[PDB]
Write a structure and sequence with these properties.
This is part of a larger assembly, with three copies of chain A (about 525 residues). The first copy, chain A, is built from one helix and 34 strands. The first copy, chain A, is mainly β. In chain A, the strands form twelve sheets. In chain A, strands 1, 2, 5, 6, 8, 11, 12 and 31 form an eight-stranded mixed beta sheet that branches. In chain A, strands 3, 4, 7, 9, 10 and 30 form a six-stranded antiparallel beta sheet that branches. Chain A has a two-stranded parallel ribbon with strand order 13-34. Chains in contact: A-B, A-C, B-C. At the B-C interface, β3 and β10 of B face β2, β5, β8, β31 and β32 of C. The structure holds sodium ion (9 copies).
């Protein structure tokens, strides 16, 4: 309504009400006027010897709002609270509000560089509710709301990648260009604000519990089966079998089978033992798409890295986050120390080991002359009677991802973990309306010189989650996430002398135990 | 109400009413007071050279009611009746009742060992309706209701297996212990009884019919296709094709594809021909889970063993039951004779042969210098346009199995055949309340000496099944299960001189024929 | 109603409903017919060189029901659940039921010793609702309901201690004798049962949280005080002062003062360092009552043992429980290992160190000739502006205790921790009605020979607790009780191979953090 009046109050809070909890988090932000208010055609030929890095696309002046990161909404304890006493959760509804828009104009004379605000200028927000733009938000890229309410953050620029021709930079006749100014968008001078309201589609509860039974040894030990297994051949080519018995769990008919597997090699950590001076890329797991070899991280789930105990990890199949945020374009080498590496060990009983072969099966036809032989297999895909656990979500991990448009998706859980959404939280685009510099002469060609200015405002995301009440009959105490350190010299998830937020370790959600 | 009065009448019966039939079967049972009313920690290190047999779990004083075995509810003829004129069936509802509880106390002096009944003592029944305990019943273990109403049977002890550490006996911090006395349970002295009422979740009709068409040669022979296939290359590297024609069924575009396959080797039976003195285990098919190789029986369905005709069987992929019940802990070798072995030949046209390679595909890129080459594959998993038949259920086979708790199950049919249930018939636990011996001095430590006593009562299971009315236009008579023997010297499915129930052969359900 | 019918169903369960949770636990029990149905005058002269052990009292045939022990109602996890996410709790209501009474009669011929049940005999239960009997239950004695539902336990005999004359065994004219048969009590043959209903008086929530601020350094560091302190004297006897400043927390006016203290000496544990071959008794803390020195355990709270970190413990001031139950009358020496020792370190910031002096104050009057002097004090009692935390309750610790009858109690929290109740859960007395042997001749003297018989039945205690919802604004994750072990070789709070319940460690309730 007026320049003087606050566009909105500041809400940050967690409200636990029965079976559902709602998280409101508000933060402050800056929007540079990227690209000086013009689109740039952007492309890249193969780099580091890989045509897989070749792409053709565009860069826009628009910045976008990303909150698809659990820790944007959850405080550490709140996370803890959720992960220690709940069997699952899914996000039901979401509402966003952008306010307190303040736009500033900077002018530099002889390197003076002063910042003063014009009140006249506007900002533009619109939400792509019909998913007509490329959806960038699903793919684990920087720029989400901080995990720490205080810290101010700068909005990521919006750019998308269309299809390359022939793993060269060049475009193809099918490649398309999207203009963001084609959608109608609200324009906000300082008095005004934006409110976004949303309702999540129905998705299965993320299963935040670990199996207390091993899949194969489901059957009670006490009683033998009524089925028998082939065991040997008498001296004449005659078949003989024995009863499956009691405890033995190797030779017992099974009803259900582990998850889809594809070996990705295991590397030791800590004490370790790894091969020396090794170039990782040649031996990484990959999928060939459009005649180029692409690395696939988080090899599609149905597998596990680490067994608890031993340090070996399926690095190809694993989620790794920096301890602290770092910078754009960094090429610096990182040792194990800095990294927050994650173990899928909790999901190990249901899931298969990623650095072991998946099993073996007979490779020959037996005969009088010739004995039976078997062959191990490094990759078993999906089968009926399958059963597995999808990868755990982390306080630091992403929340959801958009399902690609195609005729079919096999049942889909983002390989990076989270909620597979057909219709996910809409792209939220915002840009600073351009203000022309001093233009004194008319031309047909478009204006090229602009006043340089950026915007800053606050934004609040309010989310509603539904919970699966914990209900177990387990007698003894379950393991839970404890803030347990010995001889600490600083708090975890807390500012330091310098003032920066410190996060020591990643946090899964699997602590509670459910028998199969 | 009173010691003298019967807690319940005896119901055994089959009622066929239109499209649905209800089976009531009642039997008699004994419940030993296992473990002298205490839990035992039970574990096993690797045996027979396999860490797969390593497990950590517990044994309870509770016995359980298992009826998950088709022949508990169906008399032979009734089975027959169902299998010869129906295209499918699923269980809609179930109701159970336990009554006529009689508890007896045995005392032995100088080896006298007398049995007299105390009327004062109780028994405990409760049903785990919320699936909070490990579900043992799904996994084809002994102790179900007899197939023969007269025979008295002893209730299986309840024990479950939690997760092992490192394929050693030892437990893990995630391993959980369940106390059965934590659930509230009805206590029954002799006058009282138990009634259980249940409603099955909706499941697809088990398809009890065999295809009368071969999958690939679906198209009518009379007419050629309007598509053509590449056939050869002219002397210059030039492509040439011919019309697909008429009857030929090898080279004709196909819309649908066979089921998932994984070779498990074939062994001859009867006349046979098998390799001599062979140790089966090295060459068995297996899956690696938690860093141990486990054998998987009934290799997940989508495959067949036997083609009719020839005796070769996919033993790894097959269902084998003893002819007669046998004993706990038996290690005796069994020849073919005793076994009731099953052929999935009826499902052969839709399904793939288990001891053959699944097919072949090109393994090289053709060039002027270099000719095209192909490679057979021993394991093909799931694909779009797939189609297969799940394994047939047997009078002797199990009915249902519980789906494991995880984020996803690919469409699941118990590998052992039956109905995949998310929420299956609840574990039914019963135990004898302990009666202290003579205790004359107080101690803080728990009482250790008990009166020795066991319980016996009857129980009835009443089930309602829905049927898919047979409706075919097949002119000529279909094959049906006939009780056909030549020169019989005893009846089948009938007592003998000794008094024991004799079952000669297994009985599938596929007899009726449905064109695709 | 009838011998045959169950007097009551078995309820064991924990129901969490919003702000209040209700715990139902049911167990089995035995009641020996103590004393052959007669009272015994019992007394003791000084033993182990202490007249403090001298007492005069009586022993009854009655056994009593004790559940005043947290772990009787809480399963491990349930405890956990409560202690990790709640700021407090108090018991609002309680209801008890005794049923399934079974009375047995034992006869021995030539050492045969058979147990058969007579159905005719009765049992007697009554509750002393008017607190007219000596209340024994408050004082941490054996015989409470087991922590493990399965285990059967024997009811403690009821005996009370009246006043001794002169620290000799002999009675005094003021000493009184209570006859339990004077109260009217329900008599129960096997068909019948007992129901007890109760409502707790209003008591402050047990504060289950640890202070995140140190009492003395409450004031913010950033700002100095506006008060100044005397610091020195100029060379002439002149007073000079400095401003209290900033961070310094030693010399800053304080509003609130630590808790009441009385030094009890500190002993090292683990690595330790303690004096060798030491007789503990001479140097133990004590209070003189009726001209005898009595040891006081749990020296009245307002103090702490242990500071976290260092192993030294105020053993006199500490709660120690055996790892496993042990036996009546044991004199066996116990090393540290067996013991579950407790640290009040969480309450350390508010509370005072027990093995340090409490402080110091000036002991002289300063003059020109003579400098000021100070003296440490080993015991400071209560003062206005006091503030402290009462000792934490343990899964293994007792729940409540009865306040003694006198004109005044200073604000009272059982020194053993728990709820100080003016009117606590009534003594629940039960005894087996005596059955005369064969008496063939009349006498005036009371019958002396009885049939020997004992009773066994189940009992259920149902409690309702109110909770203080956790509500904190602490950003970083709080510490919580985790079931965290490394290289476990058995589960904790779970049966072992032998069948006995294993409890490794004690569990406080202070995990959550509240700033002052
Ligand atoms: Na730029
Ligand atoms: Na929607
Ligand atoms: Na670095
Ligand atoms: Na046994
Ligand atoms: Na149901
Ligand atoms: Na044999
Ligand atoms: Na006695
Ligand atoms: Na009262
Ligand atoms: Na000892």
């Amino acid at each position: 309504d007026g320049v003087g009046n606050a566009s909105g109050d500041w809400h940050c809070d967690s409200t636990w009400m029965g079976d559902r909890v709602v998280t409101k988090s508000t933060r402050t932000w800056v929007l540079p006027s990227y690209n000086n208010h013009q689109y740039r055609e952007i492309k890249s030929g193969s780099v580091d010897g890989s045509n897989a890095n070749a792409y053709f696309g565009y860069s826009t002046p628009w910045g976008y709002f990303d909150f698809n990161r659990f820790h944007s909404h959850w405080s550490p304890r709140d996370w803890q609270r959720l992960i220690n006493n709940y069997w699952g959760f899914r996000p039901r509804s979401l509402r966003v509000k952008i306010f307190n828009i303040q736009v500033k104009e900077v002018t530099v004379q002889d390197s003076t560089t002063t910042i003063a605000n014009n009140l006249t200028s506007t900002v533009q927000v619109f939400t792509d509710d019909d998913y007509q733009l490329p959806y960038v938000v699903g793919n684990g890229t920087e720029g989400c709301l901080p995990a720490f309410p205080p810290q101010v953050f700068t909005l990521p620029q919006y750019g998308y990648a269309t299809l390359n021709r022939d793993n060269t930079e060049n475009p193809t006749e099918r490649s398309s260009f999207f203009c963001l100014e084609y959608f109608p968008s609200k324009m906000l001078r300082t008095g005004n604000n934006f409110e976004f309201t949303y309702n999540f589609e129905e998705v299965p509860f993320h299963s935040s519990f670990a199996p207390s039974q091993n899949l194969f040894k489901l059957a009670n030990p006490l009683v033998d089966q009524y089925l028998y297994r082939f065991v040997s051949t008498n001296n004449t080519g005659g078949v003989q079998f024995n009863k499956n018995l009691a405890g033995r769990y190797a030779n017992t008919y099974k009803n259900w089978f582990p998850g889809p597997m594809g070996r990705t090699q295991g590397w030791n950590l800590g004490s370790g033992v790894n091969r020396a001076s090794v170039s990782a890329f040649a031996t990484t797991n990959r999928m060939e798409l459009e005649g180029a070899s692409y690395q696939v991280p988080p090899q599609p789930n149905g597998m596990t890295n680490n067994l608890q105990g031993s340090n070996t990890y399926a690095l190809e199949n694993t989620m790794i986050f920096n301890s602290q945020p770092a910078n754009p374009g960094t090429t610096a080498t990182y040792l194990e120390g800095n990294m927050l590496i994650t173990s899928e060990s909790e999901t190990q009983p249901v899931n298969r080991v990623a650095y072991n072969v998946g099993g073996q099966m007979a490779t020959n036809n037996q005969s009088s002359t010739t004995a039976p032989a078997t062959g191990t297999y490094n990759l078993q895909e999906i089968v009926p009677g399958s059963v597995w656990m999808e990868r755990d979500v982390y306080l630091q991990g992403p929340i959801w991802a958009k399902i690609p448009e195609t005729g079919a998706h096999f049942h889909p859980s983002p390989a990076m973990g989270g909620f597979g959404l057909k219709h996910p939280p809409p792209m939220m685009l915002i840009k600073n309306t351009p203000v022309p510099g001093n233009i004194t002469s008319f031309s047909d060609v478009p204006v090229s010189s602009f006043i340089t200015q950026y915007s800053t405002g606050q934004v609040t995301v309010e989310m509603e989650w539904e919970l699966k009440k914990e209900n177990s009959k387990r007698w003894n105490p379950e393991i839970q996430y404890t803030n347990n350190y010995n001889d600490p010299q600083f708090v975890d998830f807390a500012p330091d002398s310098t003032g920066e937020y410190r996060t020591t370790r990643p946090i899964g959600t699997r602590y509670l135990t459910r028998p199969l």
